[PDB]
Symmetry: C2
């Protein structure tokens, strides 16, 4: 038996018809090279993802929301131990400059997307429990807060290809398991199914950047802070940015509403954790300013 199985989810290859249009819409609207592990997972359920998406789209494409994602990114740094650069270790292991740059680009794209997915999940979750995710403030978004960000991926950014966990080496399987378990999580992030093709780096990543802050006051407090930024930000939305489970009782079964309720709560924690995590990795290379910069939609 594998150290690590594969979690229940509609894979990117599995998304058919109406659903595969949505995965694209997500890519393009959010200018992100992957669909979130949680979206993939929540998509097995009929109706929900497509409907919640349709009600989130108009709100997440704005410069307003992008400014929110920037607040998340900006404050996602952990008041933690100081970390050594991984660069010398990669060179001595014989990595090319060029290869390391490919890693840092990966990290950079990941750190662009995660915070937007923090906005995303906060919308979906809060709306599910009929709490404030839009159309409540007296003052609508005005001036350029309401402008739309560019559609599609940034020039020279392709969609990621996530590694197939079944086919992967023991080494890769294990480091991912380890990173999952260090944080008490359910699965490997899409983040790590991208970063996993470099198990040797992740092993160093885990020892130098993530294991020493995992489960700590400082780390969870930094999750609390960014979740709060996300939760306050979404009330600025012009119209509600998700569906409410009470409006879904013709669409989902009692069992299903249950499942989705837990799934949403879980992913609202997972995404925050992962956001912090990967920024911290790119902090080990460069520093807190470069690591939390918006490098894509300016």
């Amino acid at each position: 038996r594998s150290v690590l199985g594969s979690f229940p989810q509609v894979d990117h290859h599995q998304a058919k018809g109406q659903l595969a249009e949505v995965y694209d819409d997500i890519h393009n609207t959010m200018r992100v090279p992957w669909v979130a592990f949680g979206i993939r997972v929540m998509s097995q359920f009929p109706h929900f993802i497509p409907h919640a998406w349709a009600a989130l789209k108009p709100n997440i494409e704005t410069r307003y929301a992008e400014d929110g994602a920037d607040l998340i990114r900006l404050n996602s740094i952990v008041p933690g131990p100081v970390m050594p650069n991984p660069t010398p270790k990669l060179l001595r292991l014989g990595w090319t400059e060029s290869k390391i740059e490919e890693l840092k680009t990966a990290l950079d794209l990941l750190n662009y997307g995660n915070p937007k997915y923090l906005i995303l999940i906060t919308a979906f979750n809060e709306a599910w429990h009929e709490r404030d995710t839009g159309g409540r403030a007296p003052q609508k978004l005005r001036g350029r807060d309401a402008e739309r960000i560019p559609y599609g991926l940034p020039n020279s950014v392709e969609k990621f290809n996530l590694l197939d966990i079944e086919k992967a080496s023991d080494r890769t399987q294990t480091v991912l398991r380890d990173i999952r378990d260090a944080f008490l999580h359910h699965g490997p992030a899409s983040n790590y199914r991208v970063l996993g093709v470099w198990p040797d780096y992740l092993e160093i990543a885990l020892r130098d950047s993530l294991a020493p802050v995992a489960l700590s006051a400082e780390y969870d407090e930094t999750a609390r802070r960014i979740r709060k930024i996300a939760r306050e930000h979404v009330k600025g939305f012009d119209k509600p940015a998700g569906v409410a489970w009470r409006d879904m009782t013709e669409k989902l079964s009692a069992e299903q509403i249950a499942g989705l309720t837990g799934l949403l709560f879980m992913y609202n924690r997972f995404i925050a954790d992962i956001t912090i995590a990967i920024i911290r990795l790119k902090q080990a290379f460069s520093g807190p300013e470069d690591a939390t910069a918006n490098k894509y939609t300016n």
Copy 2:
């Protein structure tokens, strides 16, 4: 539209036959006068509650597991503002000392049980992800540790009846809904379906005790602290105290394995938040030492 509606679950009365024996064996093994919300909700899935429960049973029934509960209970105090006593307040509403004493007994019972439930949900959540919940330790439980605590509810302890939410007043509904949303939770705890026969108090409770600490660093750190105690404790079990999703694949569809992964995580947080809440609630009547004692299994 109703201000709050009932969350989907196998209500106490609805459990038939084999699941009904399970709800009981829970009641009695844990010496608690209510089956947790999270089990009720989670029971609607085939196989899992009965199965996870069979593995928890011999572990949670030991004196060792009772010490576990006591540690959580002891460490559940928030270092927040000092709260006024509500006793004068309830007297001014004409509550008799006798009625007041009825509320405190109920608070004691909720406070007896929430810590044990945190143990339950920790075992279930961890085992599911094949993380450590028993059997890994060098030598087995010995001495006082291995003994079975008493079976059955304590003397003069009657089973609670949850209040019907649908049927309940607007005021019961408002205050419960306010309590749910103040913590970003999914529904009201069994605890509040008990305490909500008394919405005048819950109202005081929220304004005095709960709302000034909801979502604060101190409240959230307290949760981390107690969740940690619980995660370390189940490691001392003689054998695993739950079931792994990988072993359940004949018994559960992908969709449900996903739904449960979520619910498990969500209740692990939920139960911990509530343990702290209801303790806080008693702490205002009678200080920290009282609020955290084991008054039932000594």
